[PDB]
Amino acid sequence: NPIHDRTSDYHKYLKVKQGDSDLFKLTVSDKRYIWYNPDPKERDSYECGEIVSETSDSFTFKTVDGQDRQVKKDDANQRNPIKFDGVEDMSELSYLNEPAVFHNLRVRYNQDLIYTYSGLFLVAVNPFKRIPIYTQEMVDIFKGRRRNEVAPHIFAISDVAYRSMLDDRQNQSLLITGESGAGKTENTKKVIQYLASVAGRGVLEQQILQANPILEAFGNAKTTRNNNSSRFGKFIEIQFNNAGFISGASIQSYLLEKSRVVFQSETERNYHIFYQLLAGATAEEKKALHLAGPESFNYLNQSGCVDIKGVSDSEEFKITRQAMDIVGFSQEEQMSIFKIIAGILHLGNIKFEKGAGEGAVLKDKTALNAASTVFGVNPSVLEKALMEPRILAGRDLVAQHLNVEKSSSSRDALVKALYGRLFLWLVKKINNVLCQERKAYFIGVLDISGFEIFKVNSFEQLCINYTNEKLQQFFNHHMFKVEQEEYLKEKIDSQATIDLIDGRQPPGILALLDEQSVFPNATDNTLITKLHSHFSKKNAKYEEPRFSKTEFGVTHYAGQVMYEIQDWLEKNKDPLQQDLELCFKDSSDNVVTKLFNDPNIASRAFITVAAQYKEQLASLMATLETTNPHFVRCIIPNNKQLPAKLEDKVVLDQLRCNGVLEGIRITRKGFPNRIIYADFVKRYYLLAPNVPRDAEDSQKATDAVLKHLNIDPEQYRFGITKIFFRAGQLARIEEARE
């Protein structure tokens, strides 16, 4: 029994090592410390300082250097007694300050303990190295175990959700968010792995599992923050029958980063699939596809990075091709997907030349003709449609000769649509396979980024941020109720931001954006002007910059984020020349024809991108609203992708943005420590005369100690089953003499 075998890997990897004694006495000391900022400028970097004295109003402590300082008791960040170092739930700490929180988190990480709870949340720190806690043997141990019974772990939250599902007959949700590279997908895959094991019986399970890899090849890429970043968000519905067995699955994708297909920053890569293809394609497939090295392609030859360390695109291509096979994609299907990938590479190879007049021309039909063949479309129609699209100018339909820039840009537009569309198609194709109309229950997993606050924030960041204001409010509401429940079981702000963004009347940012969208001739300037006009000095969550003329700022949950308006008009419309669609609709390819002839794929509805985003977010929320949710906050330890490197600033910032610290401060004001009578006595019986560790009237005994100690009744609160302590209370208690 691993949970009991102190020699087990379980103990080794998941628990703080346990000695031979329980004795309260070991932990005895007389020293008292505070967490202080040695450099007031750098407030997230703190040092421990012993309190050498005290006044009625302050504290006087000694620094590392032996430098004495004074602090207000109220501004003091007192350090919890050493015994608290490493607890599995921050909700267990007595002093709940920010430094204290990071500390516990750090003590744990120092021991390779990546999972820690914070009340309702499961905090997970990226180890940046392998930890063998995900083996089948690991899985088997979590089965049926209460949260309190076992150590913190993703498998643990997953078990709770499945048991709740079965016991409450209620659907469930796991929300996993955090920065790029923080480890979301990793945890996501574990949740599924675990579910499949605990509820599976396999063929479906297989196909389910195999879906991921497909999604990864097409929607994942190498960025500066992660070698395998998911450039899209997702919602995974794991379906079950009334018996508790997996019946199916459904996938919902969002915000795919199409842009990446025609452009990548230095060092980054295009989607993994491009490379897998280039590498593991048979030599006899290459020729059929007019393939070469990535170096030979405009879309792959520009970041100065075509491969990933510790990664074989060919080996991976095998992997992908297998999954497709398992899922059920016909060879013919597979072909076409590759052809598309191919065509896309060819399209980017097209060189627009425009010297003849002021309209572009094609001196070389090579690339062009390559695209056409693989697409199974006409080169002449493609050609025209690209540089001479007929545009409706009133009553007349006239073909316009496009310049070079415009020409290239349309070609790019074509490529992005191909991709985005193919992506949708795959998702669709997969759901068909695993998805159930008639399902009894479900467990859903949402994996997407948390707030994004980059150097430069564009339309996509507004969107993601918007989603996050909603998730945060959901958490907040959910937290409110359950807190009340518990306080009830025992005898014991985002609206404004959301409105500014999605409001109808008065119109919010998105409504103004849609409005400007109707006008062919509107510009970024008209748009940014309209926005300031309506909110500058008028809406409290908005800010007009002192000097930039292309940006505006939104005060979010996370804090202020400054956005830039470039291309928002275009992005909202996501325009594609009709001649283009025309061209592609006749496609000899059975896969191509769908992308264009299927209204479910080829069109949004009439609605704009923003309108579609709002809608999907609402359906999402709605659904979530019907489940019992679970929250996992994935934390990146540093920005270097290194182990044993947990940077306070890096960390603190995420804890502030993600709601963990907020949940704490809040709880901090209440009665944060809620202990079970038996457990209380066991550890502190010694504090009072006449109390045996094992006492049948735990509540009475509890009262004994408190009474003996002469604690202030305002500080503690008798619950039907637990004793509730205000902040600092347990600490001093702990700090008492045997």
Active site residues: 180-181, 185, 226, 229-230, 450, 452
Strand partners, 716: 725
Query: Is the distance from CB of 61 to CB of 69 less than 8 angstroms?
Result: yes
Give Cα separations from 388 to 146, 400, 411, 413, 586 (angstroms).
66, 5, 12, 15, 19
Give the one entry of Mg ion, ligand ATP, none that residue 172 binds, where binding means its C-beta sits below a cut-off of 5 to 8 angstroms depending on kind: none
Is residue 259 marked as binding?
no
Cα angle for residues 290, 294, 296 (degrees, 5° grid): 65
Q: Which is nearer to ligand ATP, 452 or 735 (CB)?
A: 452
Q: Interface residues with ligand ATP (CB under 6 A)?
A: 114, 126-127, 130-131, 178, 180-186, 225-226, 228-230, 449, 634
Element (H, E) at 393: strand 390-393
User: Least separation, in Å, of the C-beta of 8 and ligand ATP?
Assistant: 19
Using CB distances below 5 to 8 A depending on partner kind, what does residue 226 bind out of ligand ATP, Mg ion, none? ligand ATP
The reply to whether 282 sits in an annotated binding site is no
Confirm whether residue 179 is marked as ligand binding.
yes
Ligand-binding annotation for 296, yes or no, is no
Q: Closer to Mg ion by CB, 179 or 412: give it.
A: 179
C-alpha–C-alpha distance, residues 336 and 344, integer Å:
12
- Report the side by side order of strands in the sheet with 628-635: 115-118, 121-125, 628-635, 172-177, 441-447, 233-240, 246-254
**Shortest Cβ distance from residue 469 to Mg ion (Å)?**
21
Query: Which CB, 125 or 385, lies closer to ligand ATP?
Result: 125
Residue 581 touches which member of Mg ion, ligand ATP, none, C-beta under 5-8 Å by kind? none
Pick one of 230, 468, 572, 654: the residue that binds Mg ion (CB under 5 A). Answer: 230
Q: Which does 449 bind (CB under 5 to 8 A by kind): Mg ion, ligand ATP, none?
A: ligand ATP
DSSP 551-583: EEEEE-SS-EEEEE-TTHHHHHH----HHHHHH
181-200 residues near Mg ion, rule: CB under 5 A: 184-185
d(C-alpha 237, C-alpha 139), whole Å: 21
Q: Is 178 annotated as a binding residue?
A: yes
What residue 126 binds from ligand ATP, Mg ion, none (CB within 5 to 8 A, per partner kind)? ligand ATP
Report the residue number, 635 or 681, with the smaller CB distance to ligand ATP: 635
Residue 119 annotated as part of some ligand binding site: no
Residue 467 Cβ vs Mg ion, minimum distance, rounded to whole Å: 15
Strands 229-230 and 220-221: antiparallel
Nearest to 684 by CA among 719, 716, 710, 709: 709
- Are 206 and 195 in contact, with CB atoms under 8 Å apart? no
CB 422 within 8 A of CB 333: no
Residue 183, annotated ligand binder?
yes
In the bound state with ligand ATP, the residue whose beta carbon lies nearer, of 229 and 698, is 229
598 binds, among ligand ATP, Mg ion, none (CB under 5 to 8 A by kind): none
* Residue 416 labeled ligand binder: no
Cβ nearer to ligand ATP, comparing 114 with 402: 114
Is 373 among the residues that bind Mg ion (CB under 5 A)? no
Per the structure block, which two tokens stand in for 620? 């999402």
Task: Check the CA dihedral 351-355-357-363 and report its sign.
Answer: negative
Residue with tokens 């599902």: 165
What the block records as the tokens of 126 is: 């990226």
Please state, in angstroms and rounded to a whole number, the distance separating the CA atoms of residues 517 and 604.
Answer: 15
Q: Applying CB under 5 A, which part among 178-186, 315-323, 340-348, 352-360 lies near Mg ion?
A: 178-186
List 673's β-bridge partners, or say none.
725
- To Mg ion, the closest distance from the beta carbon of 619 in angstroms equals 22
Nearer to ligand ATP, 229 or 276 (CB): 229
**Which among ligand ATP, Mg ion, none contacts residue 374 (Cβ within 5 to 8 A by kind)?**
none
Q: How many residues belong to the site for Mg ion (CB under 5 A)?
A: 3
* Nearest distance, CB of residue 257 and Mg ion, angstroms: 12
The amino acid occupying position 629 is P
Residues tagged in the binding site annotation for ATP: 178-185
| Residues at the site binding Mg ion, with contacts judged by CB under 5 A | 184-185, 230
